[PDB]
Amino acid sequence: VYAWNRKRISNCVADYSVLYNLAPFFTFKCYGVSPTKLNDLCFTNVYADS
């Protein structure tokens, strides 16, 4: 948490179908978007932190 990584994801085919099928006790909470509608919207830049 004190030193996180920020992967620059760009120029890809974002298929979020492989995401929700994760380990037990998972949450797909979205602040602003809906997790169900993330398949017909062209995203410009996506940043992933860990």
Partner: protein, 49 residues
């Protein structure tokens, strides 16, 4: 290894998008109907519906 469920180790990954007018790059997967000239039709240009 014996902590409570509420205090067990978790891992969090957050995704921050930039859904604005800039050229899109990580557009999801969804066809590409051919184009059509002047006609009363529905369009989907990179999200703009």
């Amino acid at each position: 290894p014996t902590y409570g469920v509420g205090h067990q180790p978790y891992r969090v990954v957050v995704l921050s998008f930039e859904l604005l007018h800039a050229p899109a790059t990580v557009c999801g997967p969804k066809k590409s109907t051919n184009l059509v000239k002047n006609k009363c039709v529905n369009f989907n240009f990179n999200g703009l519906k």
